[PDB]
Ligand binder design. Structure first.
Ligand SMILES: O[C@@H]1[C@@H](O)[C@H](O[C@@H]2CO[C@@H](O)[C@H](O)[C@H]2O)OC[C@H]1O
Ligand SMILES: O[C@@H]1[C@@H](O)[C@@H](O)OC[C@H]1O
Ligand SMILES: O[C@@H]1[C@@H](O)[C@H](O)OC[C@H]1O
Ligand code: NA
Ligand code: NA
Ligand code: NA
Length: 134
């Protein structure tokens, strides 16, 4: 039941969420993505174990709007910001690209939250999976 942050974590495999819905993805490899993402929404992945320090996160994203950002926090949706990732317009809801952002995460087991932020006026993005790099 521990998750491995150094291999892809599928975004739909969350343990709790606020604000979002899942759908089948047209990204290569098929599977699913989370979507209907708005400013202040989040997803929680429990028991993410880091054996060594993480220095960045890579996220597979799509957006038909101006996009937004993903904040990486632990413990709760308000927990200390460990890094963020900018998500641009990608040309459509199933036009997928990989983006990256720096993080600083020390070894330990965490409840990881991705908290989505941007304009309140439009849905922000879709996310297929994410993975950390050491
Ligand atoms: O996650 C995506 C949803 O956000 C998307 O919903 C659209 C949001 O933008 C609006 O301008 C559209 O009316 C609305 O349907 O649907 C696709 C899904 O991948
Ligand atoms: O352009 C491609 C798009 O059609 C989808 O499959 O997501 C991956 C992209 O490279
Ligand atoms: O590799 C990516 C491909 O799978 C999609 O389209 C954008 C590229 O960056
Ligand atoms: Na939402
Ligand atoms: Na960043
Ligand atoms: Na996925």
């Amino acid at each position: 039941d521990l998750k491995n942050p150094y291999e892809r974590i599928q975004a739909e495999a969350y343990d709790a969420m606020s604000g979002i819905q899942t759908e089948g993805t047209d990204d290569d490899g098929g599977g699913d993505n989370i979507g209907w993402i708005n400013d202040g929404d989040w997803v929680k992945y429990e028991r993410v174990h880091f054996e060594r320090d993480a220095s960045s996160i890579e996220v597979r994203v799509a957006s038909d709007t101006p996009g937004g950002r993903i904040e990486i926090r632990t413990g709760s949706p308000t927990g200390t910001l460990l890094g963020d990732v900018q998500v641009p317009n990608t040309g459509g809801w199933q036009q997928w690209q990989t983006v990256t952002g720096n993080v600083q995460i020390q070894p330990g087991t965490y409840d990881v939250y991705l908290v989505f932020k941007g304009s309140p006026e439009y849905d922000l993005m879709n996310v297929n999976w994410f993975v950390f790099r050491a």
